[PDB]
């Protein structure tokens, strides 16, 4: 049976996501215009925007406030790119293997991601991830839970209070496991939890590749000028 507390957690996550995720993408206009490292100014801004939205989602997660701010900081810094990649799935379209944001100018393709400082080494595995995640055909409830579980990870380096961070994660993971069983019908249900957890593992690797690529881009001072200060603080550290 799905419990009242667990139903509460799903309602909170779904609403927090609606508040932090606009399917219109209206704000995209605020970003520096994309050029088709022509993309980098535009895409750095989108990531900087995405970071802010991820933070707003993270605050809403039940039990996240209980954590020390330092622990809040460590989780967000390490998970930010991963959550942004998970969130992106919503815009990502199988039809063209690209992220569609509503307009041609805001529609993003491997060349565009390449256009702004990223190797295929990152991009080829990332596109595979979006395809595999899309295949899962997750309920919005599942997608929101995965993002939350990803943010609250006990193992992230620098974590002070893993015991608390695991206890918060466990409640979210139990809610997801119970939700799949109670509200997810076979066959889609089949091995659905384990597959979602595998996606978290794929994220870690994607995150690591991003770190090394960002650092290479970061090392050149001129390229670093293109980025936002919030991007420099989080991914730059």
């Amino acid at each position: 049976k799905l419990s009242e507390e667990q139903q509460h957690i799903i309602a909170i996550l779904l609403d927090a996501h609606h508040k932090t995720y606009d399917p219109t993408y209206a704000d995209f206009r605020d970003f520096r215009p994309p050029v088709r490292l022509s993309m980098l100014p535009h895409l750095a801004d989108l990531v900087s925007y995405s970071i802010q939205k991820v933070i707003g989602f993270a605050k809403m997660i039940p039990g996240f406030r209980d954590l020390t701010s330092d622990d809040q900081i460590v989780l967000l810094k390490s998970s930010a790119i991963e959550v942004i990649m998970l969130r992106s799935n919503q815009s990502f379209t199988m039809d063209d293997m690209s992220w569609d944001c509503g307009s041609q100018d805001y529609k993003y393709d491997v060349t565009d991601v390449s256009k702004a400082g990223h190797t295929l080494e990152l991009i080829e595995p990332l596109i595979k991830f979006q395809v595999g995640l899309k295949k899962l055909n997750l309920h919005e409830e599942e997608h929101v839970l995965l993002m939350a579980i990803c943010i609250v990870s006990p193992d992230r380096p620098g974590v002070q209070d893993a015991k608390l961070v695991e206890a918060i994660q466990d409640r979210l993971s139990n809610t997801l496991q119970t939700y799949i069983r109670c509200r997810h019908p076979p066959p889609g249900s089949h091995q659905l939890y384990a597959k979602m957890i595998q996606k978290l593992a794929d994220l870690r690797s994607l995150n690591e590749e991003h770190s090394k690529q960002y650092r290479s881009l970061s090392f050149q001072p001129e390229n670093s000028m293109k980025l936002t200060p919030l991007v420099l603080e989080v991914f730059g550290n």
Partner: peptide, 11 residues
Amino acid sequence: KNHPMLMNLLK
């Protein structure tokens, strides 16, 4: 530690 903007958004 040296995360001024991220800390402010977290508040």
